[PDB]
């Protein structure tokens, strides 16, 4: 959604120079049926040696995030056993976001297959230290635990 501040930001980016600008926007929703009065911060820098120019849009409440510190090797297990598709009465009905949890996992549209394969690839995860990232897997396991 075009503002007059965003036209300024575009003309600033095209000139290949760095900057930053926080202001109040009109953020059309993802379903294209609502509009919110957002609060964004456009930080941008030029991509060196190229004609492009990169920018990162970031809300004010998005300057911090949760880094899951689960390194006991057993806490991740004690959160992971709770996601299996047999315990769907003590916990609710869960879906797993099809992300790049790691290269052996192949995302599908049949979400229950992804939940399954995710469970098996959780089962033997300790040997996959240089294989797939602790960040996303720990964050998702911790979120499953809190939920």
Ligand X SMILES: *[C@@H]1O[C@H](CO)[C@@H](O)[C@H](O)[C@H]1NC(C)=O
Asked if 68 interacts with another protein (CB under 8 A), we say no
CB under 8 A: which stretch of 45-53, 68-76, 81-89, 117-125 binds another protein? 45-53
Dist CA 146 CA 139 (whole Å): 11
Among positions 33, 74, 110, 130, the unique one binding another protein when judged by CB under 8 A: 33
Own/partner pairs for 44-47, CB < 8 Å, 24+ apart? Answer: 44/9, 44/12, 44/13, 44/18, 44/19, 44/20, 45/18, 46/13, 46/16, 46/17, 46/18
The minimum distance between CB 38 and ligand X, in angstroms, equals 9
Q: Which is nearer to ligand X, 116 or 132 (CB)?
A: 116
* Of 27 and 84, CB closest to another protein: 27
Considering the rule CB under 6 A, would residue 48 count as an interface residue with ligand X?
yes
- Contact between 65 and another protein by CB under 8 A: the answer reads yes
Find the shortest distance in angstroms from Cβ 72 to another protein: 23
Q: If DSSP codes are grouped into helix, strand and coil, which group holds residue 19?
A: strand
Residue 97 CA: distances (Å) to CA of 114, 144, 146: 9, 12, 16
C-alpha to C-alpha distance for 36 and 143, rounded to whole angstroms? 27
In this structure, what token pair is assigned to residue 3? 């503002």
Query: Least distance to another protein from the beta carbon of 44, Å?
Result: 7
Task: Choose from ligand X, another protein, none: what does 22 bind? Cβ within 5-8 Å by kind.
Answer: ligand X
Positions touching another protein (CB under 8 A) are 1-2, 7, 10-11, 13-15, 20, 26-29, 32-38, 40, 43-59, 61-62, 65, 99, 135-136, 139
């Amino acid at each position: 959604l075009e503002n007059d501040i965003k036209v300024e930001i575009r003309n600033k980016m095209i000139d290949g120079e760095s900057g930053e600008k926080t202001f109040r926007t009109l953020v059309k929703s993802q379903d294209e049926r609502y509009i919110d009065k957002g609060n964004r911060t456009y930080t941008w820098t030029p991509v060196n040696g190229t004609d492009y120019s990169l920018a990162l849009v970031l809300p004010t409440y998005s300057f911090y995030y949760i880094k899951a510190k689960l390194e006991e090797t057993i806490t991740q297990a004690r959160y992971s056993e709770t996601l299996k598709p047999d315990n769907f009465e003590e916990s609710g009905y869960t879906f797993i976001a099809p992300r790049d949890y790691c290269n052996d996992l192949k995302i599908s549209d049949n979400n229950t297959e992804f939940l399954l394969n995710f469970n098996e690839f959780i089962d033997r995860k300790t040997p996959n230290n240089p294989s797939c990232n602790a960040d996303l897997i720990n964050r998702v396991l911790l979120d499953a635990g809190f939920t």
